[PDB]
Amino acid sequence: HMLRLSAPGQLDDDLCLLGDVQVPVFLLRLGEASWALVEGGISRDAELVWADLCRWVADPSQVHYWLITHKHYDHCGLLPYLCPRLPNVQVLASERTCQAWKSESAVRVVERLNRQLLRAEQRLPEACAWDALPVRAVADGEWLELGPRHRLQVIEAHGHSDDHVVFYDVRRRRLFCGDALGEFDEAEGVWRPLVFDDMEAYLESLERLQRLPTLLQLIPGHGGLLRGRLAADGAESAYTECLRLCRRLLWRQSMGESLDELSEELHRAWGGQSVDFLPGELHLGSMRRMLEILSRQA
Numbered sequence: 001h002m003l004r005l006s007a008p009g010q011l012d013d014d015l016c017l018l019g020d021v022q023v024p025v026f027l028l029r030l031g032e033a034s035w036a037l038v039e040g041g042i043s044r045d046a047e048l049v050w051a052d053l054c055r056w057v058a059d060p061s062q063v064h065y066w067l068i069t070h071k072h073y074d075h076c077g078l079l080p081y082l083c084p085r086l087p088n089v090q091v092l093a094s095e096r097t098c099q100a101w102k103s104e105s106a107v108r109v110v111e112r113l114n115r116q117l118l119r120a121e122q123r124l125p126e127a128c129a130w131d132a133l134p135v136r137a138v139a140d141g142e143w144l145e146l147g148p149r150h151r152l153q154v155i156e157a158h159g160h161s162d163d164h165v166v167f168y169d170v171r172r173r174r175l176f177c178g179d180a181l182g183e184f185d186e187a188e189g190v191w192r193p194l195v196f197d198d199m200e201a202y203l204e205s206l207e208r209l210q211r212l213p214t215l216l217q218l219i220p221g222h223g224g225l226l227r228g229r230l231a232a233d234g235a236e237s238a239y240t241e242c243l244r245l246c247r248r249l250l251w252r253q254s255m256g257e258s259l260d261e262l263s264e265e266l267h268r269a270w271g272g273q274s275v276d277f278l279p280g281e282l283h284l285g286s287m288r289r290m291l292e293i294l295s296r297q298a
């Protein structure tokens, strides 16, 4: 489809997709000798993303920033493995996201999930300690002056998770939105909600994002770049899909169903898209957690 760019390589004059479209790392060209990365992928893609990076970046000491939307294992798994190969990089993440990397228990969960995704006999490169990452915490509303023609605003966007932020390039009307709008359904063209921490926060983040100057390019955590009407309408559509799921939950409960019934149906209808980077137990359990959240707050 012409409104979804979903191939590795160049996406715009300044922007490339590295790795797999399902868990991509974006590469911004900031100048002749300066680059940034956006989103932090899954650990097992280290050599793939590194190889792709080196096709565009002849000297990786020119990689100066790495912007991170949130602490989930599929959005920061590359950091310890590519860190050592990027001697000038500064990781830019929220305060709560940075805090997660200082927690032994939180780090354990991330490492276990990423290691479930290794192909057999696959060995990972030498890793920085999670608590030694070259991180700089960024605040809600902060302007990241990345280069002469790259200025991105941090916007708090809690709900999917309690640390989540998005990054807005107003010059290009371009929003890196992480998972805050949900998972874009490639077959049907609609947003699937991903409410895994707080429904009220998730919806209020979408209300605020809807107020941004009209979007031209919308870049979520999975699936590529959305443009045209999909970008312009994305936040509003994500919000109305979340409400649709609430009504659906209420309708079935009112017929005496357990949360497990709609959970299995959502896993069946939606779990196939992420099967290659998400353990299926996690998808089904995530569907259950989401319905538990919607059921409590509705």
Ligand SMILES: O=C(O)c1ccccc1-c1cccnc1
Binding pocket: 072, 073, 074, 179, 183, 194, 196, 221, 274, 278, 282, 283, 286, 287
């Ligand atoms: O956030 C996602 O990308 C996602 C999408 C569908 C199902 C589960 C997750 C998820 C849940 C928890 C931590 N990581 C990922």
Ligand SMILES: [Fe+3]
Binding pocket: 070, 072, 075, 160, 161, 179
């Ligand atoms: Fe997530």
Ligand SMILES: [Fe+3]
Binding pocket: 072, 074, 075, 179, 221, 222
């Ligand atoms: Fe994700």
